[PDB]
Every structure is written in structure tokens, then in C-alpha cells.
Amino acid sequence: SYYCKKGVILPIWEPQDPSFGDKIARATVYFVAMVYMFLGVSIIADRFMSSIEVITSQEKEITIKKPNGETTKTTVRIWNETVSNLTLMALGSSAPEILLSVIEVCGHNFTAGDLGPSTIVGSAAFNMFIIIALCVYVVPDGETRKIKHLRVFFVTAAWSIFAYTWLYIILSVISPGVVEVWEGLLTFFFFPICVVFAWVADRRLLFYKYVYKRYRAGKQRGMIIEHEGDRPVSKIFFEQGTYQCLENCGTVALTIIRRGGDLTNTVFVDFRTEDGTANAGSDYEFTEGTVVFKPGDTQKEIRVGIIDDDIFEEDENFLVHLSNVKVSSTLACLGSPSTATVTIFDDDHAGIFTFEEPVTHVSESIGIMEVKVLRTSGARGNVIVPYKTIEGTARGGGEDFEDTCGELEFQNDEIVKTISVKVIDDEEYEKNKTFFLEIGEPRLVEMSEKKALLLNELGGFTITGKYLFGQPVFRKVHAREHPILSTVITIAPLTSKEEEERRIAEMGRPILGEHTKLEVIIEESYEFKSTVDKLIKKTNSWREQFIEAITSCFDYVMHFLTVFWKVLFAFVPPTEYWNGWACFIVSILMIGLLTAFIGDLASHFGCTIGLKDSVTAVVFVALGTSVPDTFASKVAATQDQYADASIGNVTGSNAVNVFLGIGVAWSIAAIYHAANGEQFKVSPGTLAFSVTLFTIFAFINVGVLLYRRRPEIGGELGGPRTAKLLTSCLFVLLWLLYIFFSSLEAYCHI
Template identity: 25%
Template sequence: MLVVSRIMGHEKCESYLVFSGETALGDSFRTFLYFLGLAYCFIGLSAITARFFLSMENIVKHKREVVEVDPITHAKVIRHDKVWNYTIADISLLAFGTSFPQISLATIDAIQNIGNLYAGGLGPGTLVGSAAFDLFPIHAVCVVVPKAGELKKIADLGVWLVELFWSFWAYIWLYIILEVWTPNAVTLWEALLTVIQYGLLLIHAYAQDKRWRYISLPLARSERPEDWVPEETDSFKQESHDYEEFSETGPLYARVPATDNAIETIDNAKETMLDDVHFFILWKQQFVDAVMLETKHSKKDNIYLRAATIFWQFLLLPWRLLFAFVPPCHIVHGWISFISSLLFISGIAYIVTKLTDMISCVTGINPYVVAFTALACGTSWPDLVASKIAAERQTTADSAIANITCSNSVNIYVGIGVPWLIDTAYNFVAYRQPLRIKDASGLSFSLLVFFCTSFGCIIVLVIRRLVFGAELGGPRLWAWITCVYFMFLWIIFVVLSSLKVSGVI
């Protein structure tokens, strides 16, 4: 618990993060150290995002074998169908996974405040601020990522419109809760309905993707890649190459006899043994790679650039060693790696909440302001990385933009809904009272600013579609003009929201 005492008319934060001697340091120096720690945590989030994204790709690539019998020839026809639907993968794995830092932070904040009649402000503030970061800066980056003149458009406008509708409705719904139905409070049923709407989003988007009658919009779908990610990453290729090479030359081939009567049993045993050995070989190699420094430099690189590169690698070394404990992405189609990555993200999010509490305590800055700015930017970094990778590697803009709109929906339906459900359920049982929201007016004001600025963002995307034929890329000059415009909208949101919760306006 944070302890603040008044000494000679000044407020002094007596809480500490690591050791009690912190309180003897000056407030300015403590603030600097806490912000430095916050920045290092965000570097860790960036590092784990690459592993998370690779494991997610492996999950989505998974296919199942379907055997059908031809009704005429009675011959067996074998085909391989994708397990994951293209649209559902975007909404669930991509959007939910990249929003997990915000979700973890909000959930941890709710658990820490459980039993209080008032909800913590850190989670909702971060999630609303994250929505603005997703919509403006991430769109700004994705617009300029394609090569000069390259155009990437949304292939399935129907699915995007469905996702966009639920994204906007999420914030309308939040405003209704805070200002209309139960002003400044949240009931158990409101929290439950908030979570349920995430399931409705999944169903509606799937219905649109499959063009269900009476539910889907009558919009044609243009070309789109058959696979979620058409081109594999270098690390994924290397893992595949290592696996194939080991399978061809492994000792199992020399030790196992292949008789006709036992060939099926032997093949199954061989595959199982290869998977086990391959698992440990790749996992061991991850630790070796983590401590290896990249020494390749161009002859044109000067000594300062090389020094900066080496310094950056040493800075990443602790994170690389820590994340080497995440199992290889080939195991169980990537699920173990995926879940492990989310657990690491949760751990970093917990440290971030502690650092943010200390920053607010030492500086006296309103927690909402910290949430709108530093926390929103830092925890949204996986969203930025994922959308940037999708904009670079996919032939369409669907996943890059879907990650933005769906992440905003996930932020409300799951990121705010689940923490509020935890607190309202406890308050309902223990006190028979709803959950009170501190500074609900400031949060509502931020929602109104977000609505106004978000319309400006969507209108520009529509104009780009009509003029250039695509939302992302196009002429370099206009791409950068669009980028600057989106960043300007984000600055407007941050400044107005911060001034409101600070009591200036």
C-alpha cells in the first residue's frame, strides 16, 4: 500500500519498490529510476512480442486431415483443411494476444482493489488510452510501412465493417454504463453483458466471413491470401530446416528396422521420438542463441554505430535469456509457446503496475494521466509490432487493420469487462452494492474526444480507398501526410484527456 505523509507542508511518498533506502533518494531521482524501469519493461514487451507472433503463426498454419469417399468411384479423397478461420484468428489470437498486456494490467489492478467500493483507475484509463494509440499511431505506422507505390487494401470490407461497428459500439456501451444507466457506477449485470458481447463479436464476424443469410452484409470479397501469413519468418524457416535436417539424418533411421508388418508402428514411434529429441535440441539452441552477440557489420558502419549495436544487444541480453525458457514454437502446433508468452507478458504487466503506482505516488500525477500516456503507449507496443509485421508481410491490409479495430473491442469487452466482473461479483456478494467509478466524468470525456477524433481517422481511410484504391501504402508523400495527420489526432486526444482528468478543463 502506498503511504504518503505530510512533512513541513510537503507530501513525501514513503513507499518503496525494491529496498527501503529508496525513500532517502530525491523524488526527482526516484521518478527518473522508475521511468527508466518502465521503459526497460516496455523493451521486454517488445522482445516477447516476436516470440508470441511466431507461435501464433504456427497455430494458424495448423491443418487437419479430412478423408472423404467419392460417391461414384468409392475412392478415398484426402484433403487438408485449415483448423482456424481467417477472420476468427484475427479477432481472437491476434487481437486478444496483442492486447494481453493491457488486459493483464487491468485484471491485476482489479484484483489489487478487490473489496473496495471504488474501482481502480489504472486499468480503464490504460485501455481507453490504448484504444487511441491503436487507432492513431498504429494506423500512422501501417500507412507508411509498404514500399513506395505499393498498395494494400482491405480484401473483405464486410468483415471490417462488422469489426468496426463492434469497436465503436464498445465505447458507446461504456459511455452508456458510466453516464446513462447507472451513472458513476457499474453493476454485476452490466459487467457480465460487457464480457458476453465479445462472444457476439466473434459470432457476427464469423457469420459475415461465411456470408450467412439474413445476418451478413451483401458485400463481395476480393482476393486475399489463402494462408493467414503467406511468407514465413527467417526464424521459422530455420526451425523448419533444422527439423527436416535432423529428421533425415537422425540416429533413429539407423536403429529402427523397417519391416512390412511393423512399418506403421515404427513410423509412429519414429515420429514421436524425433519430436521429443527435436524439442530438446531446439530448446537448448534457444539459450545458445540468446547469449550470442551479432558481430556482423558492414564496412561502412562507423565505430559509434557498432558500439550502439553492441550496447543494445547487452541491454536485451537479460530479456533474451529469460524468454529462452519459452518452448520452441513447433511443439503442440505452437500452443505451449503461445501460452508461455502470455504468461511472461502478464508478469511484465504486474511489474508495470507497481512502477506506475510508484510514479504516481512520488510525482503526485493523476494515475489516469499516466495511464493515458506512458502505460497506453508501452502496453500497446505488441499491437504496433503485430500490425506492422502484418502490413509488411501480408498481401492485403485485413490483418493489420483488423488488429487495430478488434484490439479496441477486446480492450472494452475483455480488458474492462473481466476486471469489472471480478470486482462487481465480489461487491454483489459482500456488500450488495455496485462498483463505484472514480473520476467517471473524466473517463466519459475521454470517450467523447475519442469518438470525434476516430471519425476523422476513419474518414481519411475511406478517402484513401476512393482515391488510391487502398487504405495502406500508395504515393510516398501522401502516405507521410496521412501518417502526420493520424499522429496529430492522437496528440489532440492525449492533451485534452489529460487536461480534463487534471481539472484544468
């Protein structure tokens, strides 16, 4: 219409419908005042967001070292991006729309206007489309961003869309045309469910999975934001005369060469093995054979079996004798190296256990660390190595490292085993705390029966089904373990040759190596050190704020253009006072009153031109009051390793807008009206179409965002220039279509 109801603050222009031309003279003043008024919100909401950053920040103390002997004391704070803190920043960034809704309801005798809910729905569509398109385009070329937690995005996106479809439910589906107390109070109570869900999610996400932390410089002077980030007779003789074969080869391949004379001859030669150091039948199979040289053949290959057992022995040798050379159908004479001496190298040492290095320097960012324990010089048997951690300078009670005391078990032919130690991340700027880790005397456990007799073990033996080298593997039973006591079997004038065998076999038990005590020196985290060094390199309070308020030509124009708001908001107390709360109380009022002014302007620029409140809520006020959100979303998209916070801010703001603003405003109106005895009325016809259109387009937006999860695209946000431009153009087109159709239906064109 063309009659204007009185504002909360501003009174009506006394001439009404004056002329076709005078409407311009009033409307340009109203619109210019609104546009210049939005800058005040854009600045004071930034300061309010800074204050609410200060409120939820952990304090840290830094002892800065410099070439002077004295070390300076500096305080830096560490605001951590978490789902709970992003919701508070989103609510803080989303405060103007909530205060606009509350003031719009309360000012006009508790009667709902179009402006309040309509600017919330318009800001919802703006937040979902235009800000996400901007976040798509601001990621630099050659870089992409991916949502680390897709399931968090799902739950949050579903909750965000569910808020608006619930708005449609209470306006049209359930109890149409009215808003009862049980509807508005429930819609308000939905928000604590969201914040408890955020708190539960933050605790579960941090505890369940360790997150690598990266520190970047904050917006303020002394804040360090931390975020999760990514981390010529014929002669017969041996070819060699000396052979070297391991015990576990199974067969040693001897070779016999016939040379000279004539190839076309038939001769017989008999090879038999003879006892040397290695005994026949126990270490080498007694192989006696006869071979014949076919005519035209020079070499003949023979094999001798090597018996493998688990007992440690020294190097041994056995001989091979050739004899009885005969000529079939003198002519054949034996070569000079007739006899061969085969040597067996036993390799049944149980091991030598060493730490890799005597000292390692580590930071707390490693979290769980692995320390190798090398087992050299042998592999046979199964060996337990006890290990423990000793507190040095670093006191250990789970505050600096977890006390681990265990027993490593080295299986057969297992060389490297890892000790897992937990280091608590204190994220201190500089510390040099040390703790030791020591391995005790190792004991062999499982063995064959013959080795058990040779080592003269007396303990209880449980027979295991595993077969090694054709013999059963018995295991010594620890006193803690409780067998049936019927399964266990005790194996339990020596010839003075068997004593020597026992002495040689006794050298096979596991021993310790050179390094038994590893000193781990905990050094400072590299990310925090680099961040603080960069911050120092890049580098009372009332006075400083005032002179910084009053300070290339484009910068001069912008500064002069906003000098009124900067001077006025320099009267806001600095964020150091009252732990930040001094700003928090004073800034929000400076929003509220200011926000009230916007409403009156939006109530009058509509009536002067003849523009409905729904349209001027959708296109003008929604764009003006959502500009504090887009800066946070853009910075979070640009700086983060993973762009979870950028989309999360949009989604949290879109949920918080409804659940706070429409919640408290409509609940207060419903309580007042129901107590007074008159039912509270809201016409759902205009808002129902807009909320349905927003839901339909939000599903498309979510689908298009999920389409970029393919490895061809690269990530959720950014990537190749073509995909960036296509996605941004699609989102801007979607927002344009939304506002065009909503504005057309508001004028009943449909």
C-alpha cells in the same frame, strides 16, 4: 497525491516526500525500470504471438526432391489469416492490457483504480491513430493497398467504437456512478458475440466467394502464412463468266459489258436463267429480264435471287443466257462469253465438334475451369452434344474434381461452347493426377419441315414460334420432357432422284471431329511450389534456442541491451512441444507477473512526481503495452496484397481490450461487491471526457480513411508521397490533441 498505496509486488519507498531533489533520484530509477521493463513485454508477447500462431495452424507434409535418389521428409505448417485467427492474434497481442486491468482490480481489494481502464482507453486512441499512421507510411512508394472487404471493416469499426460508447453508457447514462453485475457480465458477454460473428463471417466469406490464395514465408522457422490475393461492231458479253456466291447472300450480282463500236447507240438484250444442276424455282428464283443500253453507258448490273433453305446440298450451278440483241434507231453482235455459269456453295452443315487440344495441364488453383468445344465446318441447326467426366488416376467424388455429366446445346450459328469443371484445391506440393473428359455422339434437334421430311425423322415434333428463312422451326421432344401430347405433331415408290437428295442431305447431320477425349493432367499449384522453393533457398531445440539467445555495432549494442531478456525468455519451452501449448501456458504467465510489475511502477512513478494515474496511463503505459500490436500491424500492411489484416488487427485489438479487460475486471469487482452487500463505485467524470473525445476523433479517422477510397488517391493505405505525409501528419496531430486535452482535463483545467 504524494502518499503511495502499496503495490501488488513492490513495497513503498519508506521515506515519503523527502526533498525536491530526491524525488528525481527515485523517479529516474522508477521510469528507467519501467522503460527497461517494457522490452520484456515486447519480447515475450512476440513469443506468445508465435505460440498462438502455432496453436491454430494446419500441419503439412512435404517430400523434398533432391539430386540424391532418396527424398527428404519435411514438415511445414500453414497459418491462414482469417477473421477468427486475426482476433486470437489480436487478443494475444492485446493480452498485456487485459492482464494489467485484471491485476489492477484484483490487487487493490477489488476497488477500481484509474490506471486499469485509463490505459485501455489510452491504448485505444494510440492503436486507432499512431499505428494506422505508421501503416500508412510503411507502404512502399509506388504501391498502394485497398481493403478488399469494406463491409467487414464497417461492421468491425462500428463494433469497436460501440464498445467505448457502451462504456460511457454504463458509467454515466444507465445507472450512473456504479457498475452492477448485469452491466459487467453483459460487457463481458459481448466478446463471444464478436467471436461467433467472426466465425460466421469466415465461413460465409470463404464459401460464398472463391479466394485466390498466395503463400508467403512466416515469422518462424517452418511456417508459411497464406493470404487472399489478386489473380469493230459493239460486243455484249459477261465481265467474268464465272461467279461464286454463298447460299445466304440472297442476290448474286452479274455484270454485262458492252465494248467497242460506238457508245452513242441504243441496243436491247434479253437475259434468262436456265436450269443446270440447281433447279429453277427451288434454289434460284427464275429471273427473266430485258435490259437496254443507254448511249454512253458501257456496263449494266443485273441481280439474280438465291433461295436459301436449311437443307444441306452440294455445290450447284445454273446458267444465264443472253439473246435477242436489237438496235434501236449487224451493228450489234453478241460477245463470245455469252452464257454465264453461276455456282452456289451450300453451307448448311450442322457441324463438326472437336476439343481444342488433346491434353491440357492445369493446377488446382484455377478452381472452376472452362473447356471449349469447337464447332467447325458449319453452323446450321441446333445440336445437343452429351458430355461426361471419367475418373482416371484422379479419383473423383468431389474430393479432387466434381463429377459433371451434362448435355451441351449449340444454338444456330453458335460456334464455341464451354464446359465448366470444378477442381478441388488440395494445395499439395507436387502431384500429377489425371482425369478424362469425353463428349458423346451429337444429335440434331430443331429443323424446318422439309429437312425433317428429307432426313425421315419419326419422333414427336413440337412447333416453335421462331421463324427461320420463312419456315417454322420444329423441335424434337425428348422422352423426359412431358408435353400436352396434343401440341406434338408427327411429320413422318421414291423417284430415285429424291433418294439422291436424301443421301446428300443425310451428310448434313452433326458428326464428331478428331479429338473426342481430353485428358486433363492436374499439376501442383504454382504459388505453393514457388513459396516452398524460396523458403528452402533462404532456409536439441532447447540447446539451439539457448545458443541463439547468446550471439554492425548497433546490432551488438541492441543485443547486449536485451541479452538479459533474451536469456530469461530462452527458458520458455520451444513452440514444437505440446503442439505449441507448452509455450502458450508458460509464456502467458511470464506476461502476467511481468505485467503486474508494470502496474506497480506506474503506481509509484505517478506518486513520486505527483502525476495522476490517468495521465501516466494515457501517455506512458499505453505506449509501452501497445508496441506488440504495432509490429503485427506493420508487417501485415507491408506484406499483404490487400491491407485488410493490418487495419483489422487494430480494430480487433481495440474491441478486445474493452470486452475482455474491462469486462472481466469490472464484472469480478461487481460480483464481489454485490455479493458482499456494498455497491461498487466508479467515478465517471474523468473517463467520460476521454471516451467522448476518442469517439469524436475516431469518426474523423474513419472518414479520412474512407476518403482515400477515391480512384485518384489509389487505395486505403499508401500511395503518393504527399498524401502519405498529409495523412500521417493529420493522425499524429489527432493523437497529440487527444492526449493533450485528456491530460488537461484530468487536472480539472478543462
